[PDB]
Amino acid sequence: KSKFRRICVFCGSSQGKKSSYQDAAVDLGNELVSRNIDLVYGGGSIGLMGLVSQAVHDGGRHVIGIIPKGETVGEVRAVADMHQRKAEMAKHSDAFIALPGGYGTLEELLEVITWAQLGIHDKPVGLLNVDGYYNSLLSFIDKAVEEGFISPTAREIIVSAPTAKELVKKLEE
Amino acid sequence: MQKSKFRRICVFCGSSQGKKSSYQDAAVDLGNELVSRNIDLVYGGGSIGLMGLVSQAVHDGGRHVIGIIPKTLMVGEVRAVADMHQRKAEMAKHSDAFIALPGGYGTLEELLEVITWAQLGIHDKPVGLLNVDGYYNSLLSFIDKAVEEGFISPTAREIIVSAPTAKELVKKLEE
Ligand SMILES: [Mg+2]
Prior knowledge:
The structure is a homodimer.
Chain A: E1 6-10, H1 19-34, E2 38-41, H2 47-58, E3 63-68, E4 75-79, H3 82-91, E5 96-98, H4 103-118, E6 125-128, H5 135-147, H6 152-155, E7 158-161, H7 164-172
Parallel strand pairs in A: 1-2, 1-5, 2-3, 3-4, 5-6, 6-7
Helix pairs in contact in A: 1-2
The structure holds magnesium ion.
PDB class: structural genomics, unknown function
Keywords: Ensemble Refinement, Refinement Methodology Development, AT2G37210, lysine decarboxylase-like protein, Structural Genomics, Protein Structure Initiative, PSI, Center for Eukaryotic Structural Genomics, cesg, unknown function
Assembly: dimeric
């Protein structure tokens, strides 16, 4: 049995131009279903977001979408604002994984990393770096670990892998 | 004869001062740019790393400085709010634009949050990067990618303004 009851997945509300990223989202969803882990997410039915949330739901697992202020599958939670949204999503998950996404996923994925670095939480954090999507952002962190702004230890907060299967294999340890 | 359209700008940055003095000079020049433009500061609230260099530079220059700190722990004014989220909200509400000097996870998260809100149209405050010796080059390239793969609209990439010096950066923010 997985040490996680729920994993908060941040990802593209857009589907992207490559079916490769779309298949990853679906696979990640099936990985949660198989490992008996439920899904926490930002809600809605659009983009890689829809796929994984629908994939997890279709597989029979529980899905919770937390929105601020398309349709959200599973249990929906509407909160005050985007701050409360990130507050809530992070207060009910046992790990955070980001799939390729845009500014949205970045910020959320970074606040959580900053929170894990500051001690606020120690949940694992992972990047599903498919087709090299996150390569640069991943080198920038290194540029940040080289110049003196991020410690080699905090850099390790970021777990990465090219596929959902292997990716979860690392978070579980 | 010159007036900036900014009552105050918010500055985020590295808890450290970076390994290159070129980064420290950029934080000093940035504060001297705000002063030279009669722009006050909206920053965190410490005396270490780059934060200290830019806030003290603005203070010495005789401009107003406001630093918001989470009341958890513990120049110019000092405010303490409940949590880290209320911190960003105040800092964002009390400033006209946003700029980032080199920094780590926290700086990058403060930045992506205000940039993301501009994307959603919540606010229209300019956001800029003080690119010291190419520090953010790879971040700018990742975004370029996040534009080619269809996750960041061609226009949303233009939210991030950037330049190698504080003067060159504030001119771009002015528009
Ligand atoms: Mg841990």
